[PDB]
Amino acid sequence: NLTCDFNDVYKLEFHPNQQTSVTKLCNLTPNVLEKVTIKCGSDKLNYNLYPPTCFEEVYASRNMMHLKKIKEFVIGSSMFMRRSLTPNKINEVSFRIPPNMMPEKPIYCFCENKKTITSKKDIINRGIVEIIIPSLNEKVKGCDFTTSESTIFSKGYSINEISNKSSNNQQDIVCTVKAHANDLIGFKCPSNYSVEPHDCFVSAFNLSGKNENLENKLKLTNIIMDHYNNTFYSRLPSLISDNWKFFCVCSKDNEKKLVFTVEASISS
Amino acid sequence: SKSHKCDFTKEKYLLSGEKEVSCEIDANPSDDITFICPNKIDSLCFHTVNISTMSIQDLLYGSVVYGNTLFISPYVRTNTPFYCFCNLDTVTIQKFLKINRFLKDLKGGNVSEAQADEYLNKALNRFKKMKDLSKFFNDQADNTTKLNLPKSLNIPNDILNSKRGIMSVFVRSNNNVIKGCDFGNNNKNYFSHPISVAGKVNNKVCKIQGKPGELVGFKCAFEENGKVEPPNCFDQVLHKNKVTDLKTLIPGYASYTNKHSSKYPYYLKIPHFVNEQYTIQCKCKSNNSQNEYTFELDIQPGES
Ligand SMILES: *[C@@H]1O[C@H](CO)[C@@H](O)[C@H](O)[C@H]1NC(C)=O
Ligand SMILES: *[C@@H]1O[C@H](CO)[C@@H](O)[C@H](O)[C@H]1NC(C)=O
C-alpha cells in the first residue's frame, strides 16, 4: 500500500547458507498530505532502523551519507508517529507528506537485518525505503506565522509582526485566505503557541464567534492537526454548497492572537 | 457532546412577564451545562441542587463541577431531573441591567474588506471575553452564594456597590461504564476499575491503558479536604518521576477536574493524535493512608 512492511511483506529473513548480502527496495510515491509508514522489527524479528530517529532524521541519498533533519530538509512535515513492540527499540514509524513547491526529491531510511557467519564476516539484508516528495505548482492558500518568506504558504509574517514590541499585544493578526474547491489550506504557528479549537479543521469558529460549528457546512478532507508542530492542513471538498467563513486562533499568553480565517467561495 | 447554558444575566429573562422565570435544558451524558445566576438561593449549584437538597455526586455519580459548570458524568443510569432557584431581588435585577448595558457586547454580505474585519474582530472578543470568564470562575471557591465578575472587564465601582428564576435540567441515561478507577468503597461500580471488585487494583496502583481519542479518568475516595498529586492534574502529571506539563507530551488534550480538592473525579480526553508512548500518573493524597492510590495511565500512540 503506502506502507513498506519489512516483516510480513518485503520479508528480510535469511535463506539457508546465505553468504552474501542483498538489498530489497521499497519505493513509494505519495501525494501531498498522505501518510507513509515503515514497519521494521518486532518482538520476533530483530531488525533495526537507520536512522533510529526516522522519520525525524532521514538520509538524502541511498548511500547513508549526508544525514539530515526532516524539519529543515522537507519543510512542513507533520504527524510523526513512533510505535514500539520490542522493548528498547521502536518498530513502526509514520509521517504525513507536506506541500512542496520545489522539484521532487527523495528521502531515505534504511532497515538492516544483521548476522555474523563463519575467516568470518557479517551479512546484511538491507531494505531501502525510498519516498518521493511530490511537487506542487501553487503554494498553499494559508498563513505561516513563523516566517515572512514561507516556502509553503501564500501569506507570511515576520516575528517583528507577531510580537508586541512595535504594536501592543491587544491588536491581533488576522490572516484571511480566500480559497475554493479542491484547494489546500493550512497554517503554521510558532512552537509554544496553542491552537484553538483542538480540532480546528474538524471544528472551527463561526463568525458569530466562540462557536464550534463542527463543519457540517464544509466537509474537509485530508485534515492534519499536528499539535506537536502547530502545523495544520486540509483540502476543501469537491463542491462548495454556499459561501462560508470560519477561523481558528493561535494563542500565547501576553502575545497577540494569531488568527487564521478562510472564506470558501462556491466552486465545482 | 453538546454544551448547554442558562444565563439569567440576559434582559430576555430579567425583564420577563410572569413571576416564575424558567429556562429548560435537556442534556445527555458527557455534556456540560453552565449556570450564571446573580444571587444563588436555596441550594448552591452545581454542587448542591434542589429536588423540587442533594449534592450532585450522589444524584449523578461521576459528574464533575468546576466554576459554574457541570460536566455530566460519562455514565448515567436513570433519567434524572434537577432544579436550581435564583432569587432576582429588585436591585440585583437593576444592578446587573446597569452592568449588562455597559458591556454592550445572520445574512451579512460584508463586501468591503474592512467591514469583514469588524464582524470578525467582534467575534474574536466574544471568544476572548468568554475565556477570561471561565478562568475567573474556576478560581472561585466551591461555596459561593453571590456571583462576581472578573476585573479588567472595566466595570465601574459604582455599579458594583421582582422575579424568581428556576432552571430545570433533565439528562438521559446511557450504558457505557467509565474507563477509569474508583478509589472509593461503594457497590455502584460506575468505573472500569473499582477495588470493591478484586484484581482491578494492585499494590495501591490502578493501571489503565488509553488510546488516542478515548476519555479516561479516576475518582478518589471521598473526603472534604483531600488533595491530588500533582495539584494541577491533569494539566501537570508525573512523568518519568518528575512533574511535567501534560501539554509537552500530548498537546491537544482536554480535562474535566476540580482544582480545589479531590472530591470530584478527574477526566482526561486523550487528543486525536499522540506521537509516542507515554506513561503518566497522578496520586490521591490524604491524611488517611488507606485512601492513597496511584492512577497510572499508559497512553498508546495512534490517530483518530
Ligand atoms: C518554549 O518553552 C520551553 C519551556 O519554557 C522553553 O524551554 C523553550 O525554549 C521555548 N521555545 C521557544 C521557541 O520559545
Ligand atoms: C467556604 O468554606 C470554607 C471552609 O471550607 C471557608 O473557610 C470559607 O470562608 C467559605 N467561603 C464562603 C464564601 O462562605
Numbering used by the authors:
A (entry chain B): 28 to 145, 155 to 304
B (entry chain A): 20 to 71, 80 to 132, 145 to 200, 226 to 368
Which statements did the authors publish about this structure?
On the merozoite surface, Pf12 is one of the most abundant GPI-anchored proteins and forms a heterodimeric complex with the secreted 6-cys protein Pf41. Both Pf12 and Pf41 contain two 6-cys domains and the crystal structures of the individual proteins have been determined.
The Pf12-Pf41 crystal structure was determined at a resolution of 2.85 Å by molecular replacement and reveals a heterodimeric complex of approximately 80 × 65 × 35 Å in size. The crystal structure of Pf12-Pf41 shows that both proteins interact through two distinct binding sites (Site 1 and Site 2) with a total surface area of 1051 Å2, with Site 1 and Site 2 contributing to the interaction surface with 578 Å2 and 473 Å2 respectively. Site 1 shows that the interdomain region of Pf12 forms contacts with the Pf41 D2 domain, with residues on both Pf12 domains interacting with extended loops on one side of the Pf41 D2 domain. H234 and H336 were mutated as they coordinate a cadmium ion at the Pf12-Pf41 interface, which we propose may feature a crystallization artefact rather than required for Pf12-Pf41 binding. Important for the assembly of Pf12 and Pf41 is a π-π interaction involving Pf12 residue Y264 and Pf41 residue F337, and hydrophobic contacts between Pf12 F283 and Pf41 residues L159 and L163. Furthermore, a region of 33 residues spanning 84–116, which includes the β-sheets β5 to β7 of the Pf12 D1 domain, which was unstructured in the unbound Pf12 molecule, was well resolved in the presence of Pf41, suggesting that binding of Pf41 possibly reduces the flexibility within Pf12 and stabilises the junction of the Pf12 D1-D2 domains. Previous studies which used cross-linking approaches to develop a model of this heterodimeric complex showed a few differences from our Pf12-Pf41 crystal structure.
